[PDB]
Amino acid sequence: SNRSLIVTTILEEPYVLFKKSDKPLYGNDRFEGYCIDLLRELSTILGFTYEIRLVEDGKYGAQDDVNGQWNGMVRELIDHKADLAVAPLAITYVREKVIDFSKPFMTLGISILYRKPNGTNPGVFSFLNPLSPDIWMYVLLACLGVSCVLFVIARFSPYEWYNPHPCNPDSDVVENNFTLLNSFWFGVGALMQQGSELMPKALSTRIVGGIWWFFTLIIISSYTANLAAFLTVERMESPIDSADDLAKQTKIEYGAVEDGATMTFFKKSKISTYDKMWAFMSSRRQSVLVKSNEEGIQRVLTSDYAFLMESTTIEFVTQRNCNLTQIGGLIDSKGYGVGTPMGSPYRDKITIAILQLQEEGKLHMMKEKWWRGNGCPEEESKEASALGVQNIGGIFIVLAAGLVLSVFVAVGEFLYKSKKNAQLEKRSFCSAMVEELRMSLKCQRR
Amino acid sequence: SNRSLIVTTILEEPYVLFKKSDKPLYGNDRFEGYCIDLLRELSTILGFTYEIRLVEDGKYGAQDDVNGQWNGMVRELIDHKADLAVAPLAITYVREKVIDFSKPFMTLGISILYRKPNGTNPGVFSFLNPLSPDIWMYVLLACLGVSCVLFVIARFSPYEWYNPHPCNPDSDVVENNFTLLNSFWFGVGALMQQGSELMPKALSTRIVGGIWWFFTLIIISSYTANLAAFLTVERMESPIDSADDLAKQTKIEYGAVEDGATMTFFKKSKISTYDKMWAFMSSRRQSVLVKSNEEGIQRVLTSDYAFLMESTTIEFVTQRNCNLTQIGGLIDSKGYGVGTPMGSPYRDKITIAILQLQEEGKLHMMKEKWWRGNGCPEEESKEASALGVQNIGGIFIVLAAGLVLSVFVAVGEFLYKSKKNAQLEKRSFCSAMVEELRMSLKCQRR
Amino acid sequence: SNRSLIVTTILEEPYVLFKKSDKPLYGNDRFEGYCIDLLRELSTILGFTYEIRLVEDGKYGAQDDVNGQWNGMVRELIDHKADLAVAPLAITYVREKVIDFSKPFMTLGISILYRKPNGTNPGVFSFLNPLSPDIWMYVLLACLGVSCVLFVIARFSPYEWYNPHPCNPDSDVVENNFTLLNSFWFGVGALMQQGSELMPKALSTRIVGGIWWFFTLIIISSYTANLAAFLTVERMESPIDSADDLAKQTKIEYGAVEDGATMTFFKKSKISTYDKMWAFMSSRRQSVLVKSNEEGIQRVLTSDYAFLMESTTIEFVTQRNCNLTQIGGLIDSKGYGVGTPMGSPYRDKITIAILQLQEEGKLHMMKEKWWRGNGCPEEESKEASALGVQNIGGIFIVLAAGLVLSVFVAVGEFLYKSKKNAQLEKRSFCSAMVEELRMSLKCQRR
Amino acid sequence: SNRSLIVTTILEEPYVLFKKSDKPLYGNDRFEGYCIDLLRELSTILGFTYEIRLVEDGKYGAQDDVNGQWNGMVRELIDHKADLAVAPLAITYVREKVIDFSKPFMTLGISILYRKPNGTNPGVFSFLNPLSPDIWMYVLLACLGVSCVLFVIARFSPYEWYNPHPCNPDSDVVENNFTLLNSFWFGVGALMQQGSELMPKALSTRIVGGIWWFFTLIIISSYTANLAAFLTVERMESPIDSADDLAKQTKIEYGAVEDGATMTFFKKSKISTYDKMWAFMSSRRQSVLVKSNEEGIQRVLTSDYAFLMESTTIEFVTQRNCNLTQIGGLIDSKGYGVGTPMGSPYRDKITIAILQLQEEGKLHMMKEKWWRGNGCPEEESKEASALGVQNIGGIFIVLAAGLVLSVFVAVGEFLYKSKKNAQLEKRSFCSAMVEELRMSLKCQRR
Ligand SMILES: CCCCCCCC/C=C/CCCCCCCC(=O)O[C@@H](COC(=O)CCCCCCCCCCCCCCC)COP(=O)([O-])OCC[N+](C)(C)C
Ligand SMILES: CCCCCCCC/C=C/CCCCCCCC(=O)O[C@@H](COC(=O)CCCCCCCCCCCCCCC)COP(=O)([O-])OCC[N+](C)(C)C
Ligand SMILES: CCCCCCCC/C=C\CCCCCCCC(=O)O[C@@H](COC(=O)CCCCCCCCCCCCCCC)COP(=O)([O-])OCC[N+](C)(C)C
Ligand SMILES: *[C@@H]1O[C@H](CO)[C@@H](O[C@@H]2O[C@H](CO)[C@@H](O)[C@H](O)[C@H]2NC(C)=O)[C@H](O)[C@H]1NC(C)=O
Ligand SMILES: O=S1(=O)NCN(C2CC2)c2ccc(F)cc21
Ligand SMILES: O=S1(=O)NCN(C2CC2)c2ccc(F)cc21
Ligand SMILES: O=S1(=O)NCN(C2CC2)c2ccc(F)cc21
Ligand SMILES: O=S1(=O)NCN(C2CC2)c2ccc(F)cc21
């Protein structure tokens, strides 16, 4: 009970922050957080007393590189104007050459912030998904396949060659409804569940028409059922999944705090994925390198952007906001340790104490208390939105594309018939003008 | 007539009341309720005259650590001023160190108030939901757009002008089937999947019809698959059935009475489901922790609120309001017993007296007299997920709206023909008289 | 530490049973269960010692009614050849007139065993469920309604009266395809998504045919989508829900242990629901009154049967087996109390101790340890079975019913035409025999 | 050359090995692995000659309460026989009271082995699943049954025999369109929802066709709605993603190594999710608690088993077998550090040496050399729920089976006509030669 320990500590949520009460001027119950509850139960097992003191500089600790002078909390650890440094103070090779750390109470690393997938614009078509792109092409090869087979069988079968003119049938003239043009019009019209004016007689052609109807009915039933599975159970998917999946895409842009501890890892890196990721953000400096953590969260939240901070700050923000999520595992491995001056016997005593706190399972109980906030279980039994112009939206393009295609066929049939009239009339001009008159007669017969 | 014993209660209903009548100078006849009928039937089989005396404080009992003493009824019993605390005095641990109970007369626990689930509001025209109102208009404008294109293409195309009357070679006639009215009827018929009496015969008009068929195949499939998504996710909507269901729940807020025995249970609770319920309450103890029981009942009404109180006071106000419903079982387990001073010779005679009334079935009858009144019809079907008139409903209105509209057109077709029939022969009225009788020949031909 | 307490105890799972180990002959760690863990922590707070002793009779305790001699455990509580009776010993008015109980450590009551619903035979039709029985009748009234409206409009419209014989049309004869027979065949054929040979001209009749197609397309889309909601999310429902819902149905039969503590409640009852339930099982004695608990569980499991035992034994068996479930709440209210001789000071000390064990929340931790076994969470995302003959199964009846109905119409048309021939030929015999010859010509023309 | 320090390991791979070669009389060159490369690079930057010496016991270290002493490496360090326990010696609480660690060189935890999800076996002909094989046969027998009834009814009915050739009044002809072949083609066409070229005209045959239409409307709806149920519930099948997912899970059993640090964590655990995992293990500790790590790997293969061991030994054997997959994150948090005797002057020089290798990026490179080899292709698409050739598949086979069957019928129709054509004029072969050239006129008429 001699010389009560001066704990230096910086303010950062959820580690150490003030308590939301009016109730002024009492002190040392003024703070509340993760690094207060851990520090509380260190003096439960050990024996020491407080005066938690905020750092008078507002930094952690770094090099000045002009005189070697230190800053932050670890400047107070050297000249003994502090005793402990229970705070987010990561263990660093530069730091422990002048102070001493305890064994870590939290494990962390560099990870990725990115917006959670939304499903607002699934694609302008987005209806073509319940069948595979192989299957969408294999049914067009089935339509062109069956109709060529149905054309050959209808020509080489005797009972399809029937007697036309069902008004006075007594003759020798024999026609055939299945041309090549009429054979695709069967296979398209049977596919689209609509039927046609022509229906096969002559059982060899009815087996083709019978088995094409059963092929059709499974396709539309499989398309309707699988689309009913998509719209019921929305399973979203992110574009990115890891660092190498983000090291390739150029549309997303990277991001870290300028002159932070995260970009120092990418500058000093040698791994071929992260050497590419630094060459991105070194050339694009003053565009993707933000100057603070809270400003970098906004650029994920406003623009299309990814952010590289520590994993513990990601695990705190993604429990608060539901816009955001974590992408991939951990890149680096670092640890928060209790700062301690050189030679002090309180290093090994807290080192024993943290392992005592861990085997009982209290740090997991501390972490679940301060990082779990309101919680985001918002994914449930998805509230069904109607199909909109962003959802189906693309059958209106292919409808307009078919109508524009058909006008060019209509002019192509307007000229091919007039060229056939040009075999019986003059060159190009008079046969086309008389043909335009028949629509300007505006009548029904002739 | 040994001592004319003095018995203390607290004015809580249904337990004790004032007998609602005029004409004062009552004795112990001014009281009624559950504990008055319990005190009566305990007096008949044990032989003692009771004099009812309300406690001066009005509190049940608790230790104030200022004086280390009790208040209310348990202070009235330790001072030997009155025995027989026949009241809602719950048997808890700290209250039996001071006084002696009997065995309980009312099984009890902590449960959850919540509002009875109102509505779900399916409404008329709820079939119109799986497509947005932009889509229902755009499909309607597509059917009035494609049929205006197919009218123009089939008029300009030469190959649509074919030879009718399938006799009489080449017949000096040509004919266009696709008029203006016949082209809307193609587009409407293809929209409702049932093909019309006429199909295109030229490749220009078979691309318009062929791409309108693919448009309508997606529209009917997207309507059916989304309606299979709306009806599935509202079949998976389960209401709140337990306190564990409230654990993940965030929108509907919890509640308790301030410094009552209910929130006292949550402070001492080691259950992780119940400790998360206190993590809600220890933070936000200004908007959900309400002051009185009657205030929290009003909070369940005009909020999204779930109040936590004793099971008897839940199951009483659910009998008085059809807007409320107990959800969940019983969280705690406790019971009301009568109160006697420490070392009294009466708690054994009452325990045998209470068990005698339980074997006879009195306590189940003595509840229901003061418990249930004007039993609610409750509207309990709740398996009405079978698309009744409440669900689908509106397609019987628009069918009736279409059949009334068609009668107005049938009169308009009757007048327009009879006006043209009176253009040459008849004047105005005798044309309409012979035409109404023309259609009343009850025959098949002419 | 004088005269170590002789605890009498009967064997019943999960309260007290032997431990599954080979390891013979050590004693008093030999037993393990609920009433061992509670009894363990009674001697943690109090001070006393064991020799747990099994009862030498294998009963709880009852009357002989020929000499008043007791049996079971409570026979040993009277003559002091026991000290405690930590066991499932329910508090009874007959029992406490000779011994003393502590305050209860478990609350229980009479409840209902019954088989969990299965969904194996949902009904032989079972396809008629996604539309309400109002809606199934309202579409037949729509078919008969529209076709009568479509018949009247097609007669009273001029443009429907068109020129027949499209082979040489130059005449004055005018026919009409819409008869009364042909008008139902439109409305049936449009309902069944099949079309017909006849298609309306004359726009007033096309508005009827247009709006009937849109009515049809919503019905089949609503039927397919809601059936896709049933088969995805199976929501089972029991026939019975409470005692009064079981006091009405005769197909289920009741059940309790003969000369048990449960049927004594129904014999002595006065409530109008349970007086009816006793008149069932008093007249049907030796048929529904079983002689043991384990034999009564089998009759629920083999036959269609309900069983009336205590709620704690229901809460133990229904955690073991997934065939079984609990129906309704609790009928009676009883309690397990620690037996104690008269005047013994260990009654009030354990009474304080049980309330000490309860406020800390340990009996809930004891009960969740011994009643939760493997657990039955087996309801999940139901593994879809194909539609079988037990599932759809009833369209094969109405198909055969329609074909048998049509043969009687075919004979009715065979006679009505022959009666029309009988107006031109003789009475009944020769016109019917010549008409039978034309099918025996076995040809196609004439 | 100060002392030529002695360093103790344990033969566990990848950490230390034997260098696989012939030619004995090695020194410390007979070892290789992770901790040999760590000991090398710690020797280069700190300047000490190491002599590797395997520990005599082979155990890591634990207290036997018989003697209260340690064994294995931590006994080798307290006795000052050798320093530098460069080995998988995890930093735990009881091991640092005896010896001193450095700061960790490998982040570690407890995770879950589980077999990689094999198959899901969609197979060819999986479209045939939403109806049972009784139903696919009965619908086929219904189409061959109704069409045999409709052949008999339309032959016997007088009203079906109508006048063909719609000119020439009454024409001395009658005609039945419904032959045997034309009646199957009605029933097949109505089955596949696309109406044929002929419809019934009598009320007897319009009830057969009218009730066959209602039969097929239910069959196509029941096929589509069940297929929307199969494809939904296998889209809701999420694999096991956490230990909390194993908590409700019952079929796939847990596992651990006997008396290891993994099950030691579950005994001390106060987490209700992890305590339920020990409720599995404390009962069934003969079938799931296995003796060695290599035995439990074989249990994951040939069982439904989930083994619990350290995260490094999971992530090593998943690199060696493509049949295995780590599921879940990290349950525990712990780490390997090198071991030094209590109060050694080397643990500070090693901690700076370990942090120097972490800043350079050595420890991420020193893993991957001894960690990853022959990287697995992993078959990772896993969003193939879009009905590919694996899913639907088989309707392309039966379409191809129908088109090959129709060619055999077309030859049979060609021979049966040419045999009847050779019944009167030609003999056998020149009839077939002029008929093949009859169909090769490449025209539309004759
Ligand atoms: C009467 C029936 C006669 C059928 C004869 C057909 C002619 C010959 C055609 C040959 C086609 C050759 C090209 C495709 C190759 C097929 C062979 C094959 O791959 O094996 C397939 C199985 O075999 C089947 O399942 C075939 C099913 C055909 C049924 C369709 C009949 C159409 C009737 C139309 C009626 C129209 C009615 C409507 C009009 C009124 C798939 O096998 P696998 O999975 O790859 O491996 C097998 C291993 N295993 C055995 C352990 C599982
Ligand atoms: C161009 C359109 C002209 C329509 C005139 C129809 C004639 C007149 C017919 C009268 C029918 C009388 C009997 C039924 C009673 C209906 C009135 C009623 O109940 O109100 C309903 C609303 O009103 C509607 O929404 C009606 C919708 C009609 C649309 C159908 C047009 C058919 C076009 C055919 C084209 C075929 C094309 C195919 C062929 C080519 C329901 O209201 P509520 O819920 O009970 O309470 C209202 C309270 N609130 C206001 C706050 C919500
Ligand atoms: C003659 C028979 C023809 C059969 C063709 C078979 C189909 C094969 C065709 C294409 C095969 C698939 C290839 C992939 C497409 C490439 C990308 C693409 O073009 O997408 C484009 C649309 O896509 C279309 O427009 C294609 C449809 C053309 C109309 C087909 C009509 C035929 C109807 C058959 C009738 C049968 C009658 C039978 C008569 C006997 C989208 O690109 P975008 O417009 O730039 O996006 C703008 C988005 N924005 C506005 C939001 C900015
Ligand atoms: C069921 O009816 C009640 C009472 O009409 C609705 O309660 C309203 O709740 C809102 C939300 O707090 C209040 O602002 C209103 O004052 C309440 N009373 C009204 C509108 O009279 C309740 O919302 C209904 N249930 C549902 C699901 O809508
Ligand atoms: O700064 S440390 O004490 N030493 C280095 N390491 C390792 C990456 C293995 C780690 C890994 C996780 C920590 F929490 C601490 C440390
Ligand atoms: O205060 S008690 O007499 N003893 C403690 N408990 C129970 C644990 C069941 C209960 C439960 C219900 C009661 F009515 C009384 C009591
Ligand atoms: O046998 S008791 O001690 N006294 C009577 N009752 C009551 C039904 C009120 C109850 C109710 C529940 C119990 F657990 C015990 C008893
Ligand atoms: O044995 S330690 O040095 N101290 C305790 N823990 C932590 C819970 C953070 C960890 C976690 C990961 C490690 F690598 C080392 C340790």
Numbering used by the authors:
A (entry chain D), B (entry chain C), C (entry chain B), D (entry chain A): 429 to 874
What does the paper say about this structure?
Kainate receptors (KARs) are tetrameric ion channels that belong to the family of ionotropic glutamate receptors (iGluRs). We find that blockers reside inside the GluK2 ion channel pore, intracellular to the closed M3 helix bundle-crossing gate, with their hydrophobic heads filling the central cavity and positively charged polyamine tails spanning the selectivity filter.
For NpTx-8 and PhTx-74, the extracellular end of the density had a bulky cap, which likely represents averaged conformations of the blockers hydrophobic head, while its intracellular region included four prongs, likely representing four different orientations of the positively charged polyamine tail. The bulky hydrophobic heads of NpTx-8 and PhTx-74 occupy the central cavity, while their polyamine tails stretch nearly the entire length of the selectivity filter. The pose of NpTx-8 was asymmetric, favoring the entropy of binding to the highly degenerate binding site in the ~4-fold symmetrical homotetrameric ion channel.
